[PDB]
């Protein structure tokens, strides 16, 4: 009767378990399929079902309640939730009152929209039109929280029922869906100019009391200011940047208050973890969600969500790779802090014309190879919008979902299967946490930046961290591709404590950088971290006063240069360097002095390494991106650059194309690439050999005691046995190597034993997949 | 000792033949290795091999000439096309001046730019700056031909001596690479204000005279002036719109005039033909290239090329096809019209940073699908750029060439092998002249609009394009997966008769539209023609005047809404129609007045036919776009429009997804994603049973003469045999079905017969791709 947790897995009874389930949204499947779908799911080894609960749908007129199917089946609440548990499945419930999911409203009555159109959210240019999906609201707005509690003040009382907690199914209860202001967040002035805010004191007034003096704000927005009053809130870009940020942090500190408000109720009624996916739609941003939640102690569960393609076919190959090391690296390190589990939500199986099942395995096998093991498939289960209910997609609700509406099962169960066989059989993998040596610090404010796509005229450095950061070309893809799997950190929130856990921490900069953030890493370099700083230093704090604590730190001077918007007018250079000839780069590089030099271009050096104190700290004036050729001169450069700082990897390859993310005793291995790929393997003391056929991932035991046998390691993926026995998955060979310290093999399942090496080391030779070892 | 050509195929010595090549770039390979790839060239039946000539490379100084390879191994040009000779393969020559091919300046020399800087294109605010890459020159600037003729009459010997037509190897020499002002084109402003142009009786001026009076300027710039001399080139859209299309226009003109100087030269030294890749970039605009050749009556050889990634994996699925068909579309209509053969000269197998083979495939073998049988594939040996020369790559040039630096072959080899040997076994094929019963009527002016992505205030309807049409979700993305496959027409060239050569044409329709265009539609119609044109009717000429002769000719009163171009702000609307249920549409949908209501949201009518004269007219007031899923609502309205204006189509599918091209004795099967797909086909009298287990591309024979058998159909791809013997290739099963009018199956080499049905039919089962049946 209990829901607990530790910073790692969900216990129920202290029976402690690994979230693996599908979403099934029983108001858009018809009644008398649902048995069928949620066994099915069963059959995959899902052992949850998530879904919505849909405010539109339950009461479609104000004050017309139907949880029970009475006016129409897909109404039926009750009846899923007592045939999920009747089933043996857990719950995770989604109240709202916002879901998204691509329906009516987002689950908003039409009914409140228009006979209280005053909770409306407006753009400086007055209110929006009906036409639009997700009509925007304004979160504080009362009428809107008074209706808000009073859906929750019906449905919680049903939830309260089905809580594993009370001898039910529900074992989690998520508030609302990724509060992102309607999806409005990401264009800094279309929204919230209502009049509740903007109005002299209004919300807004308030919320610049709270956080700043007139002080502050005529040091931050360079005007001196009477009373609070006189600030009215941007909107446009010629207003002051640092205005335009704090008009940022206030819509985000909008939905905490919206959130908090809805916790608060929750907490009402149930006594089960209170999960919140994906604040805001951002990442850095997450920063103000951990200070507000710590602020006011609010035990929040902080899920989030992996999506990569849209109403187009699923694009998942080595291109996304530094958006996904990004996502999961910020993702562990809020969710470690705030010491709860780290669960995907929504894991993408739909809205995709196609999902080709090896891409879809390299982004589901990757999750747990980076950290996030509890998993949930959004979309599970495809099926069909009941008339008048209809948005994003029509009719449909089957956009290639694992299973279809038909009950047909899709490509991508093939690997949600195996992936479960191996979340369920390894519990040591799940207890190990994610090593980083390395660290990408992330300064939250280039964030929204990039976002809104404006780059002051007056800066040096663009904006465009999509292109030079994130993206397929990005430098963070080429940390990725080069094997430095990295954790994030936010470059405000973290000590210096936290920082010096770090070997090595790359920057990436821009015009500005607060002195606090400078500070700190002039003191991570001097006590003997090693930091990478690229394509520029700053020389402007967070109110864009002059500030070069870390320029004049380092004794390093870099030339001004303005970074060309215009395509055709940014240049190719070639960078030159130590064993590294002609390294393409973007966009203007800048002179760097000061440090002995180890890149040029021609003459030029736009690379310098600077050792002050215990550590260093390389300084490159260009933006350093993932470009894949046979010269591979990216990947060189950037080994060349691990070597110059002293940080030797934990794993070694003799083919780069091989990725490699170690956690501790088991190797997960990459091939990224539809394409043979083989070479040697240094780790953990052992090495080997392997081939990967196709694309996918494997997870590769070290020097570790599973079912009874010490292996020093193998070369497939354990995914269940029995005593001195392992059942393995090598479905990108013909071949397996396996190595054991104090045992033998009696015999083999699926195969045989085509060789001896000797000292305990035998190449296994299996037509199938799947195959078993006796000890 | 001659080449020729029909409109099909070029011809040596009356022996035709099918162009089937790679480019080897020998300035860019090590010498000493120039044999082995050669070699390994033709181990995959390439008959042909490309290359470049670098003026850069061979005049490192002014007046310094290098062909024998004295100063630097690489610049050796004679000694290789001798190589090729004496290894076999024919060579198609491109001596520049402009190379493109991520080159230093594309060819052009230092030494030229440095001591000329007169010829230096320039914006409105003037110089480019040196950083640039193929740093751009005006065309027709005196000093810049003199230099490029000085460069033609330095090589063009050299390439006279080796020609086909003097004993030689060289099959054809292309113009300059894909003429687009140095890629400052698609700037509409960008360029080129040198002084050449633009001075008072400048060029431009005296294009002014040629192609308009003041008649003319003084109605279309709205306007009265004095002389030409007054009128300045444009700067801004804030100018009126039809000035901006004549400065596009122009040029595209000065383009147009310095390729008919460079052909001009050509012909001085040259008999073979002369050919001319891309000109502009664009599509469309082929339009002013075909107008002009005309004019001219330039014997030139309109080439293409297929190009879908850069720097990032290789992304080759379904979203393409609406471009591919396009493209093959337009350009097959300009190749028949010129009455030259189709050859794609770049098509791509490198600059991508894995090429999948089942991707690479589905493009490769799409080409002669829709018509285009003579194929290069650019890049086909990797290399490395010597330093001083590198530009977009910098040291390496093997981003995953079909052959790599050390020797390799990578997978995309495997693909073009087959097709190979499919073409060169199958002339039949290749003498097919592609049907096309359904065609999109392009109109010009809207790709420039649709370049730029500048829309009017004013205008109602919006300019992309690029996601309405040509996109992953563009309108002839679902024609292609809807199984109707497109002819191109341009509207405003093509002639009322060639328009009845179909039974239904696409129109996507603007606010502006030519009466001269809008009267040939009017026609189409009375004649016994079917229209469908989207979204929304026109009401301006080509001058922005009133012209509504369409809109009242069908007596069709349609909205006036104007289209969002704010994301967040565009509407998902909900078709309903007679067997649709609620297809999904992005942005305003339009009430559409007069004719028989097809299409409906709630009340209000949003589609309607029309019959007038012997013919009739579809007109939709929305966006019909490609959106996949299983109620797959958007595909059934497009067969839902076939059926109202009666245009059977000549296959039949049981399985929608399978993607089927008609070429009268063959049937292109196509499973463009890697998914299992099966079902029965109709076509051609005959009917069968059909399993493709991947991605890929079949060419099956339908009731024809093929290696002295008569078959009925055969589920596999023809690729050679011998007398009554076939041999076969079915990647996409591990069996083979087999029909026979007159004959019996002998034996079978790589497989077996495993059944009979009656009537002669026989299925095979082979353990390989390849197998052989004797009859």
Same mark, same amino acid.
């Given at each position: 009767?209990?829901?607990?947790?530790?910073?790692?897995?969900?216990?129920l009874?202290?029976?402690?378990?690994?979230?693996?389930?599908?979403?099934?949204?029983?108001?858009?499947?018809?009644?008398?399929?649902?048995?069928?779908?949620?066994?099915k799911?069963?059959?995959?080894?899902?052992?949850?079902?998530?879904?919505?609960?849909?405010w539109?749908?339950?009461?479609?007129?104000?004050?017309?309640?139907?949880?029970?199917?009475?006016?129409?089946?897909?109404?039926?609440?009750?009846?899923?939730?007592?045939?999920?548990?009747?089933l043996?499945?857990?719950?995770?419930?989604?109240?709202?009152?916002?879901?998204?999911?691509?329906?009516?409203?987002?689950?908003?009555?039409?009914?409140?929209?228009?006979?209280?159109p005053?909770?409306?959210?407006?753009?400086?240019?007055?209110?929006?039109?009906?036409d639009?999906?997700?009509?925007?609201?304004?979160?504080?707005?009362?009428?809107?929280?008074?209706?808000?509690?009073?859906?929750?003040?019906?449905?919680?009382?049903?939830?309260?029922?089905?809580l594993?907690?009370?001898?039910?199914?529900?074992?989690?209860?998520?508030?609302?869906?990724?509060?992102?202001?309607?999806?409005?967040?990401?264009?800094?002035?279309?929204?919230?100019?209502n009049?509740?805010?903007?109005?002299?004191?209004?919300?807004?007034h308030?919320?610049?009391?709270?956080?700043?003096?007139?002080?502050?704000l005529?040091?931050?927005?360079?005007?001196?200011?009477?009373?609070?009053?006189?600030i009215?809130?941007?909107?446009?870009?010629?207003?002051?940047?640092?205005?335009?940020?704090?008009?940022?942090?206030?819509?985000?500190?909008?939905?905490n208050?919206?959130?908090?408000?809805?916790?608060?109720?929750?907490?009402?009624?149930?006594?089960?973890?209170?999960?919140?996916?994906?604040?805001?739609?951002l990442?850095?941003?997450?920063?103000?969600?951990?200070?507000?939640?710590?602020?006011?102690?609010?035990?929040?569960?902080?899920?989030?969500?992996?999506?990569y393609?849209?109403?187009?076919?699923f694009?998942f190959?080595?291109?996304?790779?530094?958006?996904?090391?990004?996502?999961?690296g910020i993702?562990?390190?809020y969710?470690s802090k705030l010491?709860?589990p780290?669960?995907?939500?929504?894991?993408?199986?739909?809205?995709?014309?196609?999902?080709?099942?090896?891409?879809?395995?390299?982004?589901?096998?990757?999750?747990?190879?980076?950290?996030?093991?509890?998993?949930?498939?959004?979309?599970?289960?495809?099926?069909?919008?009941?008339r008048?209910?209809?948005?994003?997609?029509?009719?449909?609700?089957?956009?290639?979902?694992?299973?279809?509406?038909?009950?047909?099962?899709?490509?991508?169960?093939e690997?949600?299967?195996?992936?479960?066989?191996?979340?369920?059989?390894?519990?040591?993998?799940?207890?190990?946490q994610?090593?980083?040596?390395?660290?990408?610090?992330?300064?939250?404010?280039?964030?929204?930046?990039?976002?809104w796509?404006?780059?002051?005229?007056?800066?040096?450095?663009?904006?465009?961290?999509?292109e030079?950061?994130?993206?397929?070309?990005?430098?963070?893809?080429?940390?990725?591709?080069?094997?430095?799997?990295?954790?994030?950190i936010d470059?405000?929130?973290?000590?210096?404590?936290?920082?010096?856990?770090?070997?090595?921490?790359?920057?990436?900069?821009?015009?500005?950088?607060?002195?606090?953030?400078?500070?700190k890493?002039?003191?991570?370099?001097?006590?003997?971290?090693?930091?990478?700083?690229?394509p520029?230093?700053?020389?402007?704090?967070?109110?864009?006063?002059?500030?070069?604590?870390?320029?004049?730190?380092?004794?390093?001077?870099?030339?001004?240069?303005?970074?060309?918007?215009?395509?055709?007018?940014?240049?190719?250079?070639? +960078? /030159?360097?130590?064993?590294?000839?002609?390294? #393409?780069? %973007?966009? &203007?590089?800048?002179?760097?002095?000061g440090?002995? @030099? =180890?890149?040029?271009?021609?003459?030029?050096?736009?690379?310098?390494?600077?050792?002050?104190g215990?550590?260093?700290?390389?300084?490159?004036?260009?933006?350093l991106?993932?470009?894949?050729?046979?010269?591979?001169?990216h990947?060189?450069? +950037? /080994?060349?650059?691990?070597?110059?700082?002293? #940080?030797? %990897?934990? &794993?070694?390859?003799?083919?780069?194309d091989?990725? @490699? =993310?170690?956690?501790?005793?088991?190797?997960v291995?990459?091939?990224?690439?539809?394409?043979?790929?083989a070479?040697?393997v240094?780790?953990?003391?052992?090495?080997?050999?392997?081939?990967?056929?196709?694309?996918?991932?494997?997870?590769?035991?070290?020097?570790?005691?599973?079912?009874?046998?010490?292996?020093?390691?193998?070369?497939?993926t354990?995914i269940?046995?029995?005593?001195?026995?392992?059942?393995?998955?090598?479905?990108?060979?013909?071949?397996?190597?396996?190595?054991?310290?104090?045992?033998?093999?009696?015999?083999?399942?699926?195969?045989?034993?085509?060789?001896?090496?000797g000292?305990?080391?035998?190449?296994?030779?299996?037509?199938?997949?799947?195959?078993?070892?006796?000890?």
């Amino acid at each position: 009767m209990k829901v607990q947790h530790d910073g790692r897995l969900y216990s129920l009874d202290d029976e402690r378990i690994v979230v693996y389930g599908g979403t099934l949204q029983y108001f858009r499947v018809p009644r008398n399929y649902w048995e069928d779908r949620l066994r099915k799911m069963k059959s995959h080894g899902l052992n949850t079902v998530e879904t919505y609960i849909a405010w539109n749908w339950h009461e479609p007129q104000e004050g017309v309640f139907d949880f029970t199917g009475e006016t129409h089946p897909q109404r039926d609440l009750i009846g899923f939730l007592e045939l999920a548990q009747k089933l043996g499945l857990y719950v995770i419930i989604r109240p709202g009152p916002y879901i998204c999911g691509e329906w009516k409203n987002g689950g908003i009555p039409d009914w409140l929209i228009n006979s209280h159109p005053e909770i409306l959210a407006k753009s400086p240019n007055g209110s929006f039109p009906r036409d639009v999906y997700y009509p925007p609201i304004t979160y504080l707005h009362p009428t809107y929280l008074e209706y808000a509690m009073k859906w929750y003040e019906e449905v919680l009382p049903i939830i309260r029922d089905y809580l594993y907690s009370n001898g039910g199914s529900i074992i989690s209860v998520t508030i609302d869906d990724e509060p992102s202001y309607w999806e409005t967040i990401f264009q800094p002035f279309l929204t919230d100019y209502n009049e509740i805010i903007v109005r002299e004191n209004g919300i807004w007034h308030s919320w610049l009391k709270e956080n700043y003096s007139l002080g502050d704000l005529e040091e931050r927005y360079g005007e001196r200011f009477s009373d609070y009053t006189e600030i009215a809130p941007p909107k446009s870009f010629s207003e002051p940047l640092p205005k335009v940020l704090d008009w940022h942090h206030f819509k985000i500190w909008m939905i905490n208050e919206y959130v908090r408000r809805l916790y608060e109720k929750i907490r009402e009624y149930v006594d089960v973890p209170i999960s919140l996916l994906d604040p805001y739609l951002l990442l850095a941003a997450w920063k103000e969600f951990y200070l507000y939640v710590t602020r006011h102690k609010l035990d929040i569960h902080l899920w989030t969500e992996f999506w990569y393609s849209f109403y187009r076919t699923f694009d998942f190959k080595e291109d996304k790779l530094g958006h996904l090391y990004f996502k999961t690296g910020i993702y562990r390190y809020y969710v470690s802090k705030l010491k709860t589990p780290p669960l995907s939500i929504e894991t993408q199986a739909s809205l995709a014309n196609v999902i080709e099942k090896d891409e879809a395995e390299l982004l589901y096998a990757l999750l747990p190879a980076l950290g996030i093991h509890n998993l949930n498939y959004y979309l599970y289960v495809g099926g069909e919008n009941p008339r008048g209910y209809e948005s994003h997609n029509g009719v449909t609700w089957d956009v290639y979902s694992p299973i279809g509406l038909d009950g047909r099962e899709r490509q991508h169960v093939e690997p949600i299967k195996w992936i479960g066989e191996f979340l369920k059989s390894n519990i040591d993998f799940v207890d190990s946490q994610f090593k980083a040596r390395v660290a990408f610090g992330m300064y939250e404010p280039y964030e929204a930046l990039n976002l809104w796509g404006y780059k002051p005229e007056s800066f040096e450095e663009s904006v465009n961290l999509n292109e030079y950061l994130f993206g397929e070309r990005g430098l963070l893809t080429l940390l990725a591709m080069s094997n430095v799997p990295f954790d994030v950190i936010d470059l405000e929130i973290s000590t210096l404590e936290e920082m010096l856990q770090y070997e090595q921490i790359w920057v990436y900069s821009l015009d500005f950088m607060s002195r606090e953030v400078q500070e700190k890493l002039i003191k991570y370099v001097e006590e003997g971290g090693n930091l990478v700083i690229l394509p520029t230093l700053p020389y402007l704090d967070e109110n864009m006063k002059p500030c070069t604590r870390l320029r004049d730190f380092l004794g390093v001077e870099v030339e001004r240069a303005k970074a060309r918007d215009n395509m055709r007018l940014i240049p190719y250079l070639s +960078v /030159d360097a130590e064993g590294i000839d002609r390294m #393409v780069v %973007r966009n &203007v590089a800048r002179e760097v002095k000061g440090g002995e @030099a =180890i890149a040029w271009i021609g003459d030029k050096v736009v690379g310098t390494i600077v050792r002050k104190g215990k550590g260093s700290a390389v300084i490159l004036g260009f933006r350093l991106q993932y470009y894949s050729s046979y010269h591979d001169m990216h990947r060189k450069f +950037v /080994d060349k650059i691990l070597q110059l700082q002293g #940080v030797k %990897r934990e &794993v070694e390859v003799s083919n780069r194309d091989i990725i @490699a =993310i170690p956690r501790i005793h088991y190797l997960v291995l990459v091939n990224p690439r539809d394409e043979e790929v083989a070479g040697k393997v240094k780790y953990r003391g052992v090495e080997f050999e392997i081939k990967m056929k196709g694309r996918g991932v494997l997870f590769i035991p070290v020097d570790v005691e599973i079912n009874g046998v010490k292996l020093v390691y193998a070369t497939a993926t354990p995914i269940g046995g029995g005593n001195r026995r392992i059942k393995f998955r090598n479905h990108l060979s013909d071949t397996s190597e396996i190595a054991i310290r104090d045992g033998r093999i009696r015999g083999v399942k699926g195969g045989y034993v085509l060789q001896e090496k000797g000292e305990r080391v035998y190449v296994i030779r299996h037509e199938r997949e799947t195959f078993e070892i006796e000890f």
